[PDB]
RNA sequence: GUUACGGCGGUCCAUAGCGGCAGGGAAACGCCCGGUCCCAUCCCGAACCCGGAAGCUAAGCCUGCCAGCGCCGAUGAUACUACCCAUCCGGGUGGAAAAGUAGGACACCGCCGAACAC
């Protein structure tokens, strides 16, 4: 897991409020917050294009090697604040990180699926809770569904992991449900 | 790996006592010129206090543990009687004549009542 | 200055045997019967308000104490039942009177049931409280069994500080309830 | 072809009448209320209709006593 | 337990009429429900009750 | 048809058409969703028309979720009656739909057919809308 | 003054609760023995009450541990909003949530009494 923590120039904020924040978003930045066991909550402005490149590249949970005030820092993206319509990025929380730490994480699965003909898939869940190392978070829990038949409830305690990564969502979950496929006459009797 | 099931009557009796004592306490008040006479009973011995509930402070005290009160020979009731004597003397030294009587979550009669009646006899106004 | 049979027996043998069986640290953990309970649901309260008095008289003659008359706190009209209609009598038994009652029951009446094969070991609950039931009162020689005008059965239940069914059955065995030994 | 509704009941002028800080005489009415939304504390009394009133002059303090909003009266400083 | 009197309470001797393995003990069974023959089985004398049947005369788990 | 089996209060005010969505701004159970952009009241018959539009365009197998239910009535009153004299009776049932909100979610393999189906179901509704993938 | 003690109280009353683990009984808190005397059960000395100290810290209770069931909870952003600008849209100065997050927390404080001591 040879990750390249993306680098980003961030500058501390003068003004902290709604007017300033809208002016910032307008200019083309994104406000952001930094905290953790740093215990010194910093308020930053990132640049949205660079931030979006970083996310689109390495998934949403993606470590960062920031540059604050000339000094550099290490952070993880804990939470995003998105707009529904425009689908901008309004605000970003950032958890400081030392190397070798155990922080809980929530990543996305990937259904690589080609099934039997009489088969349909149903993704009951996207997001699974994990603890891992700092530099070693995945991007995609690949789950494969091929050769299988009708009902095969892929439990959560069935996915293949890295070495040194732990599942913390309960192993009861239906991540997938392989339904007996519908009839064209069954599609008349669903939601009427 | 033996394990119990539920409530013992010690717990029942205790929490019921606290229940009815803090029921009663709604009507009783405290003040340094009219304090509250709390009683706290056990099977063996007994304890009492004069309480000021304006500051949750205490002005007098007594109990049937002190050897000078164990120097009684007679019944539990007589221990209680001499206790009432001592607290009358002490209260009227520290400067309290009138009080109320909190039965502390116990029934009136027996040792409580004989205490209080000895105190009424020996001067306290209640 | 007196001792009932079952209680002397209890303090002599049974505590010892349960100690030698279950190996408690404190003897306070030893199981001990507390009380005995009796109930009679008349059920025809809305049709005979006089069988109630009959049952009261029977349990009086049987237990030597005036029962309690349990009222109906709820009103369920599918049975005619209304708030306060007396449906049943109930008696509590504690102490020497209890031990005497168990002596009599085990030694006179239960050896007078018709084709008594055995009381189940499965009338327990959670920890060992034995809740059985009698169809008729035609059995206690205590009763004047000439005057009875109807069957008026009852329901008995025996409660103990035992913590589980194994200790309960073992104790009641040592005390001499005719379980179905299985 | 009728609207069988239409009725209503005239008011009763409930609520707080002497808020925090004010000076109140004796027997004055702090709050009118149906239930004990606000309970009495010290130097305060209850009515028949669960009204509250003052028993001793002073000034108000809407504090809580074990989860329940109370009303109190404190001693003014004599001039 | 108390006034509003209960039935009366006196001892009893349940004389085993099966094989002579009798019983005798304090009870609430007396004027209420007792039999004649005040036979002292002990230091005192108190009523007796013929025992038509019992345990040691009733084949069951405790008896054959 | 979609209706509730019983409502407590069967004569309600008109819902509000002010504000943006708080929930249902994220595809949940399928792959290809519909998202609104305007404010509107969507009824029972519209949603029936739309689900039928989808099932007659996939026709075999592939699932359809409806994250809306008409649980707020509206009151017509009978015809040619002067205003006044009460409040009419409920006749059709709407769901309010604030912008950002998601209505439908499909699960069919090929995006071609799926996008086309959702478009046919969009043209059965009063709102401007758009199509969504579960991705960011 | 002080210890794994008891009792009465308080906190704008769960930061204090529930559950699990270990552990304590000197004087005290207790449980327990029995209904002679006051007194009591809508029946029962079970409870309340009385008379004592054979027995055990098993339980109650107190002490430490477990952040797991529950609770508390920010900064910053957002929603909403007062006022103003603005031909519909939208915007600026100020105020500012809920949720979420980081985290916290197996309470704190006061008085008398004991035991312990110079």
The H or E element spanning position C70 is strand C68-70
Last-in-domain residue among A73, A98, A123 = A98
The first and second tokens of residue D40, run together, are 């009495």
3-state secondary structure of B51: strand
In a domain, B16, yes or no: no
Partnered with residue A42 across adjacent β-strands are A34
Residues of A in contact with F135 (CB under 8 A): none
Asked whether C153 and C40 are in contact (CB, 8 A), the reply is yes
3-state secondary structure of F58: helix
Number of separate domains in chain A: 2
- Which residues 6+ apart lie within 8 Å of D55 measured at CB? D26, D27, D43, D44, D45, D73
- Which residues 6+ apart lie within 8 Å of A57 measured at CB? A6
Number of separate domains in chain B: 1
The first and second tokens of residue C143, run together, are 């009763």
A92 and A132 in a common domain:
no
Cα(A140)–Cα(A109) distance, integer angstroms:
5
Query: What DSSP character marks residue C105?
Result: I
CB contact, 8 Å: C35 with chain B? no
Residues of C in contact with E6 (CB under 8 A): 60, 64-66
CB contact, 8 Å: F78 with chain D? no
Domain carrying residue E45: 1-64
CA-wise closest residue to C68 among C101, C93, C35, C91: C91
* Alpha carbon F34 to chain centroid, angstroms: 10
Neighbours of A19 (CB within 10 A): 8
Residues of B in contact with C168 (CB under 8 A): none
Domain carrying residue A17: 1-98
A55 and A30 in a common domain:
yes
- Provide the CA D16 to C1' G46 distance, Å, integer: 51
Please give the protein residue whose CA is closest to the C1' of the nucleotide G99.
F22
Domain carrying residue C52: 1-182
> Given C64, C112, C141, which is nearest E28 (Cβ)?
C64
Asked whether F125 and F42 are in contact (CB, 8 A), the reply is yes
Q: Breaks in chain B at C–N > 2.5 Å: after which residues?
A: none
Distance from the first to the final alpha carbon of chain C: 40
- Provide the CA D65 to C1' G15 distance, Å, integer: 19
Size of interface C-E (CB pairs under 8 A): 69
Asked whether F92 and F105 are in contact (CB, 8 A), the reply is no
How do strand C33-41 and strand C88-94 relate by DSSP bridges? antiparallel
Size of interface D-F (CB pairs under 8 A): 5
How do strand A91-96 and strand A29-35 relate by DSSP bridges? parallel
The H or E element spanning position C17 is helix C15-22
Asked whether F36 and F99 are in contact (CB, 8 A), the reply is yes
- Provide the CA A97 to C1' G104 distance, Å, integer: 21
Q: Do E4 and C142 touch (CB under 8 A)?
A: no
Q: Is the CB of B8 under 7 A from strand G?
A: yes
Query: What DSSP character marks residue D75?
Result: P
Nucleotide nearest to C68 (CA to C1'): G43
Nucleic strand G contacts from chain A, 22-51, CB < 7 Å: 22-23, 26, 31, 33, 35-37, 41, 43
How do strand A64-68 and strand A6-12 relate by DSSP bridges? parallel
Cα(F5)–Cα(F1) distance, integer angstroms:
12
- Provide the CA B4 to C1' G20 distance, Å, integer: 14
In a domain, B109, yes or no: yes
Cα(B82)–Cα(B65) distance, integer angstroms:
12
Q: Is the CB of B18 under 7 A from strand G?
A: yes
Nucleotide nearest to B79 (CA to C1'): G51
Backbone φ/ψ region at B17: left (φ over 0), alpha (ψ -120 to 50), beta: alpha
What are the angstrom distances between the C-alpha of B82 and each of B64, B108, B124?
A: 9, 18, 14
Nucleotides on chain G that have an atom closer than 7 A to a protein CB are 6-14, 27-32, 35, 38-53, 55-61, 74-80, 91-96, 100-103, 110-114
Q: Is the CB of B71 under 7 A from strand G?
A: no
Q: From the CA of F12, how many Å to the nearest CA of chain A?
A: 24
CA-wise closest residue to E60 among C134, C109, C103, C180: C180
Radius of gyration of chain E (CA): 14
Asked whether E19 and E25 are in contact (CB, 8 A), the reply is no
Asked whether D16 and D30 are in contact (CB, 8 A), the reply is yes
A66 and A149 in a common domain:
no
- Provide the CA A96 to C1' G65 distance, Å, integer: 31
Please give the protein residue whose CA is closest to the C1' of the nucleotide G111.
B57
Q: From the CA of C83, how many Å to the nearest CA of chain E?
A: 26
Nucleic strand G contacts from chain B, 49-68, CB < 7 Å: 49, 51, 53, 56-58, 61, 63, 65-66
Question: Domain containing B89 — which CATH number?
Answer: 3.30.420.100
The first and second tokens of residue B71, run together, are 């120097």
- Provide the CA B8 to C1' G66 distance, Å, integer: 26
* Phi, psi of B108, rounded to the nearest 5 degrees: -80, 135
Which residue reads 């009153």 in tokens? F77
Resolution of the structure in the document, Å: 3.4
Q: Which three-class secondary structure string do you get for chain A?
A: CCCCCEEEEEEECCCCCHHHHHHHHHHCEEEEEEECCCCCCEEEEEEHHHHHHHHHHHCCCCCEEEEECCEEEEEEEEEEECCCCCCCCCEEEEEECCCCCCEEEEEEEEEEEECCCCCEEECCCCEEEEEECCCCCCCEEEEEEECCCCCCCCECCCCCCCCCCEECCCCCCECCEEECCCCCCCCCCCCC
Last-in-domain residue among A98, A128, A159 = A98
| Chains near C (3 or more Cβ pairs under 8 Å) | B, E
Cα(A187)–Cα(A191) distance, integer angstroms:
9
- Which residues 6+ apart lie within 8 Å of A6 measured at CB? A54, A57, A58, A62, A63, A64, A65
CA-wise closest residue to F15 among F95, F128, F99, F127: F95
Q: Which domains does chain F have, with CATH numbers?
A: 23-136 (3.90.1170.10)
Sheet of strand E49-51, all strands in order from the earlier edge strand to the far edge: E23-25, E12-16, E49-51
CA quadruple C118, C121, C125, C127: dihedral, nearest 10: 130
A68 and A1 in a common domain:
yes
Experimental method: cryo-EM
The first and second tokens of residue A132, run together, are 């891992």
- Which residues 6+ apart lie within 8 Å of F104 measured at CB? F33, F34, F50, F51, F54, F64, F65, F66, F67, F118, F121
A187 and A153 in a common domain:
yes
Asked whether B33 and B53 are in contact (CB, 8 A), the reply is no
Cα(A35)–Cα(C67) distance, integer angstroms:
73
CA angle, E22 as apex, E20 and E25 as ends, to 5°? Answer: 170
In a domain, B110, yes or no: yes
In a domain, B21, yes or no: no
Nucleotide nearest to D69 (CA to C1'): G12
- Which residues 6+ apart lie within 8 Å of F86 measured at CB? D2, D3, F77
Backbone φ/ψ region at F71: left (φ over 0), alpha (ψ -120 to 50), beta: alpha
- Please say whether the dihedral angle defined by the alpha carbons of residues C60, E51, E41 and E38, taken in this order, is positive or negative: positive
Question: Exposure of C164 by Cβ count < 10 A (0-12 exposed, 13-18 middle, 19+ buried)?
Answer: middle
Q: From the CA of D3, how many Å to the nearest CA of chain F?
A: 5
Nucleic strand G contacts from chain F, 104-123, CB < 7 Å: none
Cα(A27)–Cα(A29) distance, integer angstroms:
6
Partnered with residue A103 across adjacent β-strands are A132
Q: Up-side HSE of residue D42: CA atoms within 13 Å toward CB? A: 15
What are the angstrom distances between the C-alpha of F40 and each of B106, F26, F91?
A: 69, 19, 18
List, as one string, the DSSP characters of F73-133. EEEE--TT--S-SS--EEEEEEEEE-TT-EEEEEE-S-HHHHHHHHHHHHTTSSS-EEEEE
Q: From the CA of B16, how many Å to the nearest CA of chain C?
A: 21
């Amino acid at each position: 897991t040879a990750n390249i923590p993306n680098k980003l120039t961030a500058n501390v904020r003068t003004r902290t409020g709604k007017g300033a924040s809208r002016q910032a978003r307008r200019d083309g930045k994104v406000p952001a917050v930094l905290y953790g066991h740093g215990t010194d909550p910093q308020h930053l402005e990132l640049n949205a294009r660079d931030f979006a490149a970083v996310l689109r590249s390495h998934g949403t949970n993606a470590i960062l090697t920031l540059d604050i005030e000339g000094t550099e820092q290490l952070a993880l993206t804990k939470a995003l604040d998105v707009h529904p319509i425009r689908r901008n990025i309004q605000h970003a929380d950032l958890l400081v990180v030392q190397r070798g730490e155990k922080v809980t994480v929530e990543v996305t699965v990937l259904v690589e699926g080609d099934a039997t003909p009489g088969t349909l898939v149903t993704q009951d869940a996207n997001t699974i809770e994990i603890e891992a190392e700092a530099l070693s978070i995945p991007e995609q829990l690949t789950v494969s569904v091929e050769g299988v038949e009708a009902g095969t409830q892929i439990t959560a305690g069935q996915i293949s992991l890295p070495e040194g990564v732990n599942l913390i969502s309960d192993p009861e979950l239906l991540v997938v449900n392989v339904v007996e496929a519908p009839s064209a006459e069954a599609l008349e009797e669903e939601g009427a | 790996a033996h394990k119990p099931v539920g409530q013992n009557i010690s717990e029942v009796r205790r929490n019921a006592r606290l229940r009815r004592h803090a029921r009663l306490r709604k009507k009783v008040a405290g003040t340094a010129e009219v304090p509250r006479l709390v009683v706290n009973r056990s099977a063996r011995h007994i304890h009492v206090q004069l309480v000021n509930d304006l500051n949750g402070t205490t002005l007098a005290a007594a109990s049937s543990i002190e050897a000078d009160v164990r120097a009684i020979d007679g019944d539990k009731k007589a221990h209680s009687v001499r206790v009432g004597q001592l607290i009358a003397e002490r209260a009227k030294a520290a400067g309290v004549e009138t009080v109320v009587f909190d039965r502390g979550g116990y029934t009136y009669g027996g040792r409580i009542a004989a205490l209080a009646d000895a105190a009424r006899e020996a001067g306290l106004k209640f | 200055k007196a001792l009932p049979r079952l209680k002397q027996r209890y303090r002599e043998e049974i505590r010892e045997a349960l100690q030698q069986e279950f190996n408690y640290a404190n003897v306070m953990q030893i199981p001990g019967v507390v009380k005995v309970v009796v109930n009679m649901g008349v059920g025809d309260a809305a049709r005979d308000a006089k069988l109630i008095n009959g049952a009261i008289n029977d349990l009086a003659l049987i237990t030597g104490q005036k029962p309690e008359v349990r009222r109906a706190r709820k009103s369920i009209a599918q049975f005619k039942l209304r708030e306060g209609m007396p449906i049943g009598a109930r008696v509590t038994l504690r102490g020497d009177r209890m031990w005497e009652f168990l002596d009599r029951l085990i030694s006179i009446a239960l050896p007078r049931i018709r084709d008594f094969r055995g009381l189940s070991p499965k009338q327990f609950d959670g920890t060992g409280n034995y809740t059985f039931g009698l169809n008729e009162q035609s059995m206690f020689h205590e009763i004047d069994v000439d005057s009875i005008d109807r069957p008026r059965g009852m329901d008995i239940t025996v409660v103990t500080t035992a913590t589980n069914d194994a200790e309960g059955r073992a104790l009641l065995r040592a005390l001499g309830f005719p379980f179905k030994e299985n | 072809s009728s609207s069988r509704n239409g009725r209503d009941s005239a008011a009763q002028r409930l609520g707080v009448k002497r808020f925090g800080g004010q000076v109140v005489k004796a027997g004055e009415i702090l709050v009118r209320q149906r239930g004990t939304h606000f309970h009495p504390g010290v130097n305060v009394g209850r009515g028949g209709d669960d009204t509250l009133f003052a028993l001793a002059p002073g000034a108000v303090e809407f504090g809580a006593k074990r989860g329940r909003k109370t009303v109190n009266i404190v001693p003014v400083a004599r001039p | 337990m108390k006034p509003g009197i209960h039935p009366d309470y006196h001892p009893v001797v349940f004389q085993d009429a099966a094989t002579g393995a009798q019983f005798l003990t304090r009870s609430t069974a007396t004027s209420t429900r007792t039999i004649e023959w005040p036979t002292p089985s002990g230091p005192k004398t108190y009523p007796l009750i013929v025992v038509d049947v019992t345990s040691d005369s009733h084949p069951f788990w405790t008896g054959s | 048809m979609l209706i509730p089996r019983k409502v407590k209060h069967r004569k309600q005010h008109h819902p509000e058409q002010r504000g943006i969505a708080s929930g249902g701004t994220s595809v949940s159970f399928g792959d290809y969703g519909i998202q609104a952009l305007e404010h509107a009241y969507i009824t029972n018959r519209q949603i029936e028309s739309a689900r039928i539009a989808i099932n007659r365009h996939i026709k075999r197998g592939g699932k359809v979720w409806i994250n809306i239910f008409p649980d707020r009535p509206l009151t017509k009153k009978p015809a040619e009656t002067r205003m006044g004299s009460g409040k009419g009776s409920p006749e059709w049932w709407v769901a309010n739909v604030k912008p950002g909100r998601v209505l439908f979610e499909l699960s069919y393999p090929d995006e071609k057919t799926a996008r086309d189906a959702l478009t046919r179901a969009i043209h059965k509704l009063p709102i401007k809308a758009r199509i969504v993938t579960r991705e960011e």
